[PDB]
Each structure stands twice: as C-alpha cells, then as structure tokens.
Write an enzyme that holds these catalytic residues in place. Sequence first.
Site, PDB file in Angstrom:
ATOM      1  N   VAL A  76     -11.205 -33.186   7.179  1.00  0.00           N
ATOM      2  CA  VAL A  76     -10.778 -34.096   8.259  1.00  0.00           C
ATOM      3  C   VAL A  76      -9.457 -34.806   7.959  1.00  0.00           C
ATOM      4  O   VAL A  76      -8.780 -35.291   8.877  1.00  0.00           O
ATOM      5  CB  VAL A  76     -11.827 -35.190   8.530  1.00  0.00           C
ATOM      6  CG1 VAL A  76     -12.965 -34.707   9.431  1.00  0.00           C
ATOM      7  CG2 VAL A  76     -12.357 -35.890   7.271  1.00  0.00           C
ATOM      8  N   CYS A  77      -9.141 -34.902   6.666  1.00  0.00           N
ATOM      9  CA  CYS A  77      -7.835 -35.243   6.163  1.00  0.00           C
ATOM     10  C   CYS A  77      -6.765 -34.633   7.033  1.00  0.00           C
ATOM     11  O   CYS A  77      -5.912 -35.343   7.560  1.00  0.00           O
ATOM     12  CB  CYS A  77      -7.649 -34.536   4.822  1.00  0.00           C
ATOM     13  SG  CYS A  77      -8.527 -35.170   3.432  1.00  0.00           S
ATOM     14  N   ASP A  78      -6.813 -33.305   7.059  1.00  0.00           N
ATOM     15  CA  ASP A  78      -5.692 -32.455   7.375  1.00  0.00           C
ATOM     16  C   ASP A  78      -5.512 -32.548   8.874  1.00  0.00           C
ATOM     17  O   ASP A  78      -4.445 -32.917   9.361  1.00  0.00           O
ATOM     18  CB  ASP A  78      -6.015 -31.013   6.958  1.00  0.00           C
ATOM     19  CG  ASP A  78      -4.943 -30.082   7.508  1.00  0.00           C
ATOM     20  OD1 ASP A  78      -3.775 -30.272   7.100  1.00  0.00           O
ATOM     21  OD2 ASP A  78      -5.322 -29.213   8.324  1.00  0.00           O
TER      22      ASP A  78
END
Length: 167
Positions: free
Chosen positions: A59-61
């Site tokens: 979900v970072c990206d």
Amino acid sequence: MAEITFKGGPVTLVGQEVKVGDQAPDFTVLTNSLEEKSLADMKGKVTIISVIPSIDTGVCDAQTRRFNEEAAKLGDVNVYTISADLPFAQARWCGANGIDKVETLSDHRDMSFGEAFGVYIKELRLLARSVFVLDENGKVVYAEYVSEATNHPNYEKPIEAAKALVK
C-alpha cells in the site's frame, strides 16, 4: 460507519468513525526514533496523517508514497505515516523516503491514537488503513477509512482538504 475489510474478511473498529469537525482528543504516539509525541506537538500548523497496518503490505507504493509526496509540496504542512510496531512496518518508510518532511510513527505501542481515532481494529489488533487531515487546532478537516485495508482511497480528496486550509 467505519467498519473495514482486511484480506476479504470484515473486521470491526474500537473507537470508530471520527469525521470532519469532530475534533481530535489529544493522545500520544511514538516516533520512528521511539520518542513520545502528542497531537499537541502537531498543532500550530496544518497536519496530514496516513495510517497503514504495515509498510510491507505494498500500500506504500500504490498511494501512500504519492499522497505524502504531494502533501509535502502543498506547503510547509506536517506529514506523518502511522504504522503498527510490527517489524515489517517502520524500517522503510515508503511514505518517508525522498520527502524528508515526512516522519513514520508507531502508535501501536500505547494504542492511544488507535483508540482515539478508532483505527485500532478490534478483531485484528492492527492499525486500520485510513487517512486524515487536521487544521492547526487539531480539528479533523478530512477523515476516511478504506473499505478494504489492503486497498487505497482516492488521495486527491485529502489533498483538496489540505489545500483548502494551507492556501
């Protein structure tokens, strides 16, 4: 209602559904340096807060990286990413890499933000995937809880909410 799903299983929240105008209690959180910080230390400027269960979750990206990167350019806003204690989650700061203004936080140690913003997942005991924007007094000016924690919100909406203040 701010009930969510995690991996295709529904899970409940403890202190639920903050919303715009509801104000924020003042709790404590830990930094990536494991120093105590409170909401009162964020007050005095517009603040933006992403919340994620982990950073290993990718979900970072997809969004957090990008949202934080934009947030940091709107103005001198405070920007934070709150994570679980969970080892996978603070090492690497996908949101706080290349935008030195962002700091990663470890609420799970005391759960105070978790309870106070109702992002403590009752069933899973993780931080919910959520995103918030706060006025200088700490007043919530955006709040969202993503209907699936392994998915991401539209991030323009908290950006517009922050623009509406910073400007």
